[PDB]
């Protein structure tokens, strides 16, 4: 197989700056504390780029999930009464994401939303709400920007297609 560029690095960058202005507008006037929560390992790169574009004061935290959805590593921060934005790299089935959303919901955050870089709507098995989407894509075999295919390509600066 081989990997071709699907969404170039510069397009991801321009799109993230828009998501950032958009998230900033949506939360700018809340005043409450804000927390961006990534799901490891996939979201680390998107989180790094996204949080630098969110001009609202906030903390960044991570959690690891994965039959029942279990927490392999919980949040270090408390979110009760805070605005929380879950940061995903890609959503397809939406199963894990919906369970994570429920788990976090029990902590009574002021608000809870999801921002994913890539969305694959045609694969949704459960229907979870998603407030911000970077790119909506067909059901393509994608890698890069945090997404791996058998432990590699995770470090590519662009989203590529495995051929
Ligand atoms: Mg993920």
Swiss-Prot record:
Residues involved in diphosphate binding: 41-42, 154
Cofactor: Mg(2+)
Binding positions for GMP per the UniProt entry: 88, 92-97, 120, 148
Binding site for Mg(2+): 88-89
Pfam families reported for this sequence: Pribosyltran (PF00156)
SUPFAM superfamilies linked to this entry: PRTase-like
Compartment(s) of residence: Cytoplasm
Principal place of residence: cytoplasm
Subunit comment: Homotetramer.
Role summary: Purine salvage pathway enzyme which catalyzes the transfer of the ribosyl-5-phosphate group from 5-phospho-alpha-D-ribose 1-diphosphate (PRPP) to the N9 position of hypoxanthine to yield IMP (inosine 5'-monophosphate). To a lesser extent, can also act on guanine leading to GMP, but shows a highly less efficient activity with xanthine.
Protein name: Hypoxanthine phosphoribosyltransferase
UniProt lineage: Bacteria, Pseudomonadati, Pseudomonadota, Gammaproteobacteria, Enterobacterales
This protein's encoding gene: hpt
């Amino acid at each position: 197989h081989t990997v071709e560029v699907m969404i170039p690095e510069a397009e991801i960058k321009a799109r993230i700056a828009e998501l950032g202005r958009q998230i900033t507008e949506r939360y700018k006037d809340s005043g409450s504390e804000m927390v961006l929560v990534g799901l490891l390992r996939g979201s680390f790169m998107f989180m790094a780029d996204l949080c630098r574009e969110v001009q609202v004061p906030h903390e960044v935290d991570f959690m690891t999930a994965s039959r029942d959805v279990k927490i392999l590593k919980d949040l270090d921060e408390d979110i009760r009464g805070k605005d929380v934005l879950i940061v995903e790299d890609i959503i397809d089935s939406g199963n894990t994401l919906s369970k994570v959303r429920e788990i976090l919901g029990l902590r009574e955050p002021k608000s809870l939303a999801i921002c994913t870089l890539l969305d694959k709507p045609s694969r949704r098995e459960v229907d979870v709400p998603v407030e911000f989407v970077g790119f909506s894509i067909p059901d393509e075999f994608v890698v890069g920007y945090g997404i791996d295919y058998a432990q590699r390509y995770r470090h590519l600066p662009y989203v590529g297609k495995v051929v």
